[PDB]
């Protein structure tokens, strides 16, 4: 029917999701359960393991810790910046695959990404997280929740809110095919500040939302109304973003021993 067009959209987004992102929820979950036959992730649980894992994590930057002035908390924060920037680039490529997205006003393409990318980063981060820690560097690291908490303030506060969101969001038991449509719905949000032409964005999001509803009914026929819980999580994502921007506000002030990557500067300029 029209529901055929909706299956086509879901499959296209899935294909583009698999191509755009190096580590899927399926592979991440296997790694976190040892149900893979790959070399396990190097566990970072303290300052020593970080030093030993520095290489495999690709958090190396210019020089190793022991020959650089920058302290451990700053080096982890800088490591996570390079991972974010790559995430932003992967999400931008995925967005361009969303039918109608490249035909939008370029200024609106920028605004959607500007407000969208970190809501998608945190959604995708949950795929990599459990109550104990997070896969880093395409699954070859595992950094513990306790280690990230133990970092001296305000750095100890950055990742904990993402763990708290992830434990809840992971209970919905979404798979990659579900997440591929959900992240597209997030990108095509009509209510982002500074949007010039909301109508074609709401038209595209209407389609993605229908596609997400069909996908949820088919892939979870045992399950019932994720869709509603799942749409409430979109507001949770905005709160994580708000909170996170405040923490970046603090560190810009309390630390002058660091600067933000330019792309992250573009994104955070005039944001909540």
């Amino acid at each position: 029917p029209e529901s055929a067009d909706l299956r086509a959209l879901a499959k296209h987004l899935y294909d583009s999701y698999i191509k755009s992102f190096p580590l899927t929820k399926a592979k991440a979950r296997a790694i976190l359960t040892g149900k893979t036959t790959d070399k396990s992730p190097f566990v970072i649980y303290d300052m020593n393991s970080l030093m030993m894992g520095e290489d495999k994590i690709k958090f190396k930057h210019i020089t190793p810790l022991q020959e650089q002035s920058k302290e451990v908390a700053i080096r982890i924060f800088q490591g996570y910046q390079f991972r974010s920037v790559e995430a932003v680039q992967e999400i931008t490529e995925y967005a361009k695959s969303i039918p109608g997205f490249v035909n939008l006003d370029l200024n609106d393409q920028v605004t959607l990404l500007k407000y969208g990318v970190h809501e998608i980063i945190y959604t995708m981060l949950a795929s990599l997280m459990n109550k104990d820690g997070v896969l880093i560097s395409e699954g070859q690291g595992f950094m513990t929740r306790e280690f990230l908490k133990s970092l001296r303030k305000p750095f100890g506060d950055f990742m904990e809110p993402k763990f708290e969101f992830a434990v809840k969001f992971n209970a919905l038991e979404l798979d990659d095919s579900d997440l591929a449509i959900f992240i597209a719905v997030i990108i095509l949000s009509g209510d982002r500040p500074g949007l010039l032409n909301v109508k074609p964005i709401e038209d595209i999001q209407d389609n993605l939302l229908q596609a997400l509803e069909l996908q949820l009914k088919l892939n979870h026929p045992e399950s019932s109304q994720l869709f509603a819980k799942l749409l409430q999580k979109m507001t949770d994502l905005r709160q994580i973003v708000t909170e996170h921007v405040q923490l970046l506000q603090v560190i810009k002030k309390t630390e002058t021993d660091m600067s933000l990557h330019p792309l992250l500067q573009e994104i955070y300029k005039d944001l909540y």
């Binding site: 932003v88 680039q89 931008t92 361009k96 370029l106 393409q109 920028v110 990404l113 500007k114 330019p262 792309l263 573009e266 994104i267």
Partner: peptide, 11 residues
């Protein structure tokens, strides 16, 4: 204004 974002998009 959003130089890198424009570049990533216009790629």
């Amino acid at each position: 204004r959003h130089k890198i974002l424009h570049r990533l998009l216009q790629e």
